[PDB]
Design a protein around this ligand. Structure first.
Ligand SMILES: Nc1ncnc2c1ncn2[C@@H]1O[C@H](C[C@@H](N)CC[C@H](N)C(=O)O)[C@@H](O)[C@H]1O
Ligand SMILES: [Cl-]
Ligand SMILES: [Cl-]
Ligand SMILES: [Cl-]
Ligand SMILES: [Cl-]
Ligand SMILES: [Cl-]
Ligand SMILES: [Mg+2]
Ligand code: NA
Ligand SMILES: [Zn+2]
Ligand SMILES: [Zn+2]
Lengths: 116, 286
């Protein structure tokens, strides 16, 4: 029902946030890849690139708009792989919603990226 | 054996002329070997592709791959995600399913597979199509009849297929067609070994009979093999992914006429050194 709840909200991302704050389970069935864990660590990559501290997921399965079958606000994820911090891997869709990729080094701000 | 991505039907069993028996195997269960947070289908397709790595697959620069039965009740395409991981970058991956799902493929075709039309030929066909099944075990039609025609009309010479079968979900013409390949086998993935599921894999398509296979017999042969050779579940192969992606072979693609396809060309097709098809623009239908 989380997919519907967000699908039929004026602001799906806000709707997802509210859903979580009220004790809803994160969206499941994000597709975890099997990988080496010796990758570049970058946020969004052509192939799994999880480093030792990440998991690699199929991109579309981690996209709220893909999963809800609704219009995108722009897809940066579909057909690609998203690296997600193991500690956040329970909620890959939320992670990609709440976070932003650094446009210089290509890592997640507040996570993999270290810059000024 | 436990280290292998799975087990291929040994030649000894392919040679038999068995009668059709019931299979002593339960397709289901909680699976003790699937690593945590990993889907059965990611594990299963991973092992399938690990197996395909050991074969002389043709790998053109502009590879074309079509994936049938890509969707699931979950609404996502785990198998497609693995294919997309396995194949060379910017390989055309098209997938299809009867019901809607989200995909990491370039195109997703929704609808019965019988509605899927294309002018272009493919280098690799993967099918995971399945209908959950009457007191007899006969060749099943449905998607299998489409598949056989698809293979015959749209698989490039040199191309390869992997088609999911089980005890009850199998087709006699598909088995027959396996003998139009340079090599074939029935492959059981180690993570799902206690199920009657296998992938019929044809390697390097020749467009003509190499062997005379009787479908009904070969399926009995398959069952006999499964009944008398239990396989211990295993996910050993999953713990080293370092060599996973398919090798960039740069396999030549040539458009040849039937009269140009001579013994030395067949020999090239048999060895996985040639693909024969046009290089036109790829258009796929509803
Ligand atoms: N006639 C048909 N045409 C197209 N798809 C079919 C047909 N019959 C069964 N299927 C599909 O076969 C699929 C079987 C699934 N178990 C495949 C799982 C999927 N390969 C995965 O990676 O998880 C279902 O999604 C069905 O919709
Ligand atoms: Cl959130
Ligand atoms: Cl491998
Ligand atoms: Cl036979
Ligand atoms: Cl060559
Ligand atoms: Cl073409
Ligand atoms: Mg050979
Ligand atoms: Na017969
Ligand atoms: Zn998306
Ligand atoms: Zn940065």
């Amino acid at each position: 029902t989380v997919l519907s709840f967000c699908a039929f909200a004026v602001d799906p991302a806000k709707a997802y946030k509210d859903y979580l704050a009220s004790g809803g389970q994160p969206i499941t069935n994000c597709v975890k890849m099997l990988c080496t864990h010796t990758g570049t660590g970058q946020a969004i990559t052509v192939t799994p690139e999880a480093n030792m501290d990440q998991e690699s997921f199929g991109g579309a399965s981690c996209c709220l708009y893909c999963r809800c079958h609704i219009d995108h606000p722009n897809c940066d994820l579909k057909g690609k792989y998203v690296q997600i911090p193991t500690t956040c891997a329970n909620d890959p869709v939320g992670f990609t919603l709440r976070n932003t990729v650094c446009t210089v080094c290509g890592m997640w701000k507040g996570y993999g990226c270290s810059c000024d | 054996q436990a280290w292998q991505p799975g087990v291929a039907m040994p030649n000894l069993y392919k040679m038999q002329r068995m009668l059709l028996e019931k299979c002593d195997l339960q397709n289901y269960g909680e699976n003790a070997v699937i690593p945590k947070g990993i889907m059965m289908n990611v594990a299963k397709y991973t092992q399938l592709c690990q197996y395909l790595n050991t074969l002389t697959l043709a790998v053109p620069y502009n590879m074309r791959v079509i994936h049938f039965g890509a969707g699931s009740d979950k609404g996502v395409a785990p198998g497609t995600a693995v294919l997309r991981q396995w194949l060379p970058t910017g390989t055309l991956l098209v997938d299809s399913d009867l019901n809607d799902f989200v995909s990491d493929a370039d195109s997703t075709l929704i609808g019965d597979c019988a509605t899927v039309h294309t002018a272009n030929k493919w280098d690799l066909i993967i099918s995971d199509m399945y209908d959950p099944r009457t007191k007899e075990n006969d060749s099943k039609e449905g998607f299998f009849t489409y598949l056989c025609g698809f293979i015959k009309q749209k698989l490039a010479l040199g191309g390869s297929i992997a088609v999911k079968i089980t005890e009850h979900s199998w087709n006699a013409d598909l088995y027959k067609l396996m003998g139009h390949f340079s090599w074939w086998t029935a492959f059981v993935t180690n993570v799902n070994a206690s199920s009657s599921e296998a992938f019929l894999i044809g390697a390097n398509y020749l467009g003509k009979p190499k062997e005379q296979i009787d479908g009904y017999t070969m399926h009995a042969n398959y069952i006999f093999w499964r009944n008398t050779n239990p396989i211990q579940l295993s996910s050993y192969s999953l713990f080293d992914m370092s060599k996973f992606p398919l090798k960039l072979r740069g396999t030549a693609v040539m458009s040849l006429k039937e009269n140009q396809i001579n013994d030395m060309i067949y020999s090239l097709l048999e060895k996985g050194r040639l693909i024969i098809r046009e290089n036109n623009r790829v258009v796929v239908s509803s």
